[PDB]
Ligand binder design. Structure first.
Ligand code: ADP
Ligand code: MG
Lengths: 915, 49, 49
């Protein structure tokens, strides 16, 4: 991949220096002009008077009349493939489109846009992701390397450590734009880099599990829609938690807006959640026999049968899903619990009701489907049928029971299928969280990673797409607020003589149209207060919305025909029309309490766990505070998300689908230009070029860049602002490049990057000087070794050799023979042997004393730790006993309150009877 | 290590007991609120009659 | 000496918001030197805990 980089990553940026690249354009007078070709037009300019222009088309040679406001300057070829549109001289929509288009067709998908990045989906497995982490993007700050999701992730990580502020990375596009894939690449980069620096704990198991958490939630959850073969169908927000060293201590995964309905119905060319099709596609004939699996054609719930996707085999992905779940450490009993509940949801799809001849109340013509359900989920057919066909409710003084028409029974079966899969998915998310959130205490910091479902366009839009699109609207409003409003409010707050710029780009009118609870009630909040009346009907919801919101400037009377039960709404990315079919049931999501408690009371532990916390479940079918609508649940959880995001530094990644055909290489330039317009990309770059995007606190500025101006500040203590003023005068920065606020220094684009380059130069020189001293000192040691090894032996060896020659030759040889005779040498040898063995035992004595002392201190400390653990264990057990006392007292008083409430209702009845 | 795992067990049981008491107190409050509503409305009916 | 340098710290009420600013951190630098602390972390922890 590092060799491929010349095609897919790097650019000859030096071409910006080329003088002829300017002079040729200055001769040709080349300009951009707009067009209906499904292409955008280059031209040379030849006549003008008043507001009028005429141009010659470079590709056609044709000449046409044009309007002065439609001409857009081509940047000279000098700029072509510039890595950051903020660096452009003539910033305009055609130049941004040209740079992105030619970079994409060349294979370069990532481009910078000031404080954020743009990505265009390649629709290819490009060699862009494997080798790059090892050297290329490891710690290399933004200007060191070409744009990449690794550079975004590293920049966020470095900012988190340097600035001590929690980050978020936010991917934003319609469906098929790249949010899911880029989220994976972010998680892969963080796992790799945070494990790499654990020089004694690298390749750790948590960084192994993180890479599995996404495939599992994708096997569940994701589906082949019309627009995307791996459609999310849920939004997720991963938090990766770090210690003060920058190592990962944990991860958390939240999920939103899981489309339960995907399990029950699909459009003509679409698929359910993948795991259904993975499980049916050749998992194993013994598993099929155990799980009671059957051909796709038999189920109600697999609309239009064995639908497939290119390039992947379901049989292999099933095994990979089990591998991932095992690496996550889901026990095989829990994995098989999931597979059993999946099969049970399919088997609910086999249930049917007889269309009874005598009266509308009906029963099943065959118990076998209910038998299969009982064998999978653990709820016997007799109680299952009595619950769904004939549920009984307890209401105050009285018990009430009803018959169920075939439609009501089918709605109960569908609601059970939807809620069973939802509960299974929510449990699987809880399991993955429990596996990842290994530390009982949170990290010193975190990086959030947001991947919402992309903006949805269909001919079949419903409440699911309404909530998805509302979430996309609110995230685009977060981008607009951050880039335009909080940016300029920072200039006003810090006192920097800025004059406010209006960019347009306020989405609060449409957001209020959906979410506002008071004043004019918004659509989501309005139906939240109309599903409760018995007179409620979705046609009436439509009429009430037309009365309460049909006057809103973003609401529209239906595009095609006004008489049908449709809403239509204008959104940043699109104008969208939605059908109020069963929105009453979809917003309230009622369940039959009897069958829900029978699921809770299942003989199967796994289904009983999925159906824990059943007690809150709704008390009536199709007609308040105890229950909560799906609208309220989404609004509350999304508000909690947005309140989280607003407390982080956001790092936006704008993802662009180049064409609706899922084709590689092709762009629809108008589709990309539409995305650029609605995304606010050029406004985001304009605020980057016009404003002061980089800020440094005076003390942080001194502490980091004083290396550039070491003689400029007197060695005493000095106010950070005065030190910064001195540094900036010593840096000789042009007075337009910077402004000095009340607490921060503000810099224009590229200035602080230039200072970082200067700093890296200075630090490189310092490291080179230290290396020179280090290598010199090593040479001193080498020279000392040579000095010793030569100079001693030059004497000593000559001496010993001369004596070896002499002493055997001369009569001293006689003394050699007399020495074996001498006793004194024997007595000396014996004394030495005594001393040596004494020294051995003395060394063992001293070592044993030291070992005993140290180990005894370890033993004493372990005794203290034991005592502390025992004391807190006693505290916990006594608090358990006190909680049990409180539990007994509370349950007794609850019984008293129940009996008194029933006596009060009995009095109400007796009073009304005596009247 | 034995005392550590005993502490983990007893803390888990204490947390489950606290959460159960939270359920009990919530249900008790909802019950008492409906009981007080019925008391107030039966007193209103007694004043009406 | 560190306790003496504490309270030489002066906070100014921001001209447009109800928030503390420390328009001269010299005393906070001296405090951080004497107490063994980083100026910037101390300034954050005081001005916005
Ligand atoms: N960066 C990428 N590298 C390789 N393939 C990609 C990339 N981005 C998108 N794709 C292809 O396009 C598809 C749609 O993008 P995806 O991220 O799945 O959609 P979304 O952004 O809506 O979640 C992917 O499943 C993959 O096949
Ligand atoms: Mg997606």
């Amino acid at each position: 991949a590092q060799q491929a980089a010349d095609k897919y990553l790097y650019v000859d940026k030096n071409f910006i220096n080329n003088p002829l690249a300017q002079a040729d354009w200055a001769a040709k007078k080349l300009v951009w002009v707009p067009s209906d070709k499904s292409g955008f037009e280059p031209a040379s300019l030849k006549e003008e008077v008043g507001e009028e222009a005429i141009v010659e088309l470079v590709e056609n040679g044709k000449k046409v009349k044009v309007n002065k406001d439609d001409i857009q300057k081509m940047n000279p070829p000098k700029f072509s493939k510039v890595e950051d549109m903020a660096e452009l001289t003539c910033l305009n929509e055609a130049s941004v489109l040209h740079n992105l288009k030619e970079r994409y067709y060349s294979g370069l998908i990532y481009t910078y846009s000031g404080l954020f990045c743009v990505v265009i989906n390649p629709y290819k497995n490009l060699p862009i992701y494997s080798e790059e982490i090892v050297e290329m993007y490891k710690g290399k700050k933004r200007h060191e390397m070409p744009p990449h999701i690794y550079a975004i992730t590293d920049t966020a990580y470095r900012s988190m450590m340097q600035d001590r502020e929690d980050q978020s990375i936010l991917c934003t596009g319609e469906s098929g734009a790249g949010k899911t894939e880029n989220t994976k690449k972010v998680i892969q980069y963080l796992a790799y880099v945070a494990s790499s620096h654990k020089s004694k704990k690298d390749q750790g198991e948590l960084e192994r599990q993180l890479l599995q958490a996404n495939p599992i939630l994708e096997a569940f959850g994701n589906a082949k829609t019309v627009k995307n073969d791996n459609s999310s169908r849920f939004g997720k927000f991963i938090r990766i938690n770090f210690d003060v060293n920058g190592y990962i201590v944990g991860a958390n995964i939240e999920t939103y807006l899981l489309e339960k309905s995907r399990a029950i119905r699909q459009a003509k060319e679409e698929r359910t959640f993948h795991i259904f099709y993975y499980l049916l596609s050749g998992a194993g004939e013994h598993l099929k026999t155990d799980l009671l699996l059957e051909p796709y054609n038999k189920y109600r719930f697999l609309s239009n049968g064995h639908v497939t996707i290119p390039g992947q085999q379901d049989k292999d992905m099933f095994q990979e899903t089990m591998e991932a779940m095992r690496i996550m450490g889901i026990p095989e009993e829990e994995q098989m619990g999931l597979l059993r509940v999946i099969s049970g949801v399919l088997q609910l799809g086999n249930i049917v009701f007889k269309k009874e001849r005598n009266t509308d109340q009906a029963s099943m013509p065959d118990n076998t489907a209910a038998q299969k359900v009982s064998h999978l989920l653990g709820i016997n057919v007799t109680d299952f049928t009595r619950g769904i066909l004939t549920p009984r409710i307890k209401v105050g003084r009285d018990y009430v029971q009803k018959a169920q028409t075939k439609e009501q029974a089918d709605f109960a079966i569908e609601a059970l299928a939807k809620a069973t899969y939802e509960r299974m998915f929510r449990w699987l998310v809880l399991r993955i969280n429990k596996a990842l959130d290994k530390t009982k205490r949170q990290g010193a910091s975190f990086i959030g990673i947001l991947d919402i479902a992309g903006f949805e366009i269909f001919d079949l839009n419903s409440f699911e797409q309404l909530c998805i699109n509302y979430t996309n609207e609110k995230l685009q409003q977060l981008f607009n607020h951050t880039m335009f409003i909080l940016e300029q409010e920072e200039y006003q707050r810090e006192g920097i003589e800025w004059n406010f710029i209006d960019f347009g780009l306020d989405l609060q009118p449409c957001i209020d149209l959906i979410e506002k609870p008071a004043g004019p009630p918004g659509i989501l909040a309005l139906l939240d207060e109309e599903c409760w009346f018995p007179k409620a009907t979705d046609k009436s919801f439509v009429e009430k919305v037309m009365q309460e919101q049909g006057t809103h400037p973003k609401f529209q009377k239906p595009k095609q025909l006004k008489d049908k039960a449709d809403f239509c709404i204008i959104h940043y990315a699109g104008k969208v029309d939605y059908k109020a079919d069963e929105w009453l049931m979809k917003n309230m999501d009622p369940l039959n309490d009897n069958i829900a408690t029978l699921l809770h009371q299942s003989s199967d532990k796994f289904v009983s766990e999925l159906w824990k916390d059943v007690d809150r479940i709704i008390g009536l079918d199709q007609v308040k505070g105890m229950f909560r609508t799906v609208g309220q649940l989404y609004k509350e959880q999304l508000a909690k998300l947005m309140a989280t995001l607003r407390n982080t530094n956001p790092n936006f990644v704008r993802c662009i689908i180049p064409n609706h055909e899922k084709k590689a290489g092709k762009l629809d330039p108008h589709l990309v230009l539409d995305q650029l317009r609605c995304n606010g990309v050029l406004e985001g770059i304009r605020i980057c070029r016009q404003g002061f995007p980089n800020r440094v606190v005076f003390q942080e500025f001194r502490q980091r860049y004083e290396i550039l101006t070491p003689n400029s500040i007197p060695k005493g203590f000095m106010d950070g602002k005065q030190a910064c003023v001195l540094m900036i005068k010593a840096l000789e920065l042009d007075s337009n490049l910077y402004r000095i606020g009340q607490s921060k220094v503000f810099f224009r684009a590229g200035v602080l990057a230039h200072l970082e380059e200067e700093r890296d130069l200075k630090i490189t020189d310092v490291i080179i000087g230290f290396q020179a001293c280090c290598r010199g000192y090593l040479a001193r040691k080498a020279f000392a070794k040579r000095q010793q090894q030569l100079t001693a032996m030059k004497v000593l060896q000559r001496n010993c050799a001369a004596y070896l020659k002499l002493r055997n030759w001369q009569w001293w040889r006689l003394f050699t023979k007399v020495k074996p005779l001498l006793q004194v040498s024997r007595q000396e040898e014996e004394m030495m042997a005594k001393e040596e063995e004494l020294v051995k035992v003395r060394e063992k004595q001293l070592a044993a004393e030291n070992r005993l002392t140290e180990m005894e201190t370890l033993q004493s400390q372990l005794m203290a730790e034991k005592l502390q653990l025992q004391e807190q264990l006693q505290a916990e057990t006594e608090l358990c006993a006190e909680a049990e006392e409180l539990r007994a007292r509370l349950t007794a008083k609850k019984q008293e309150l129940e009996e008194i409430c029933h006596d009060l209702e009995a009095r109400v009845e007796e009073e009304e009877e005596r009247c």
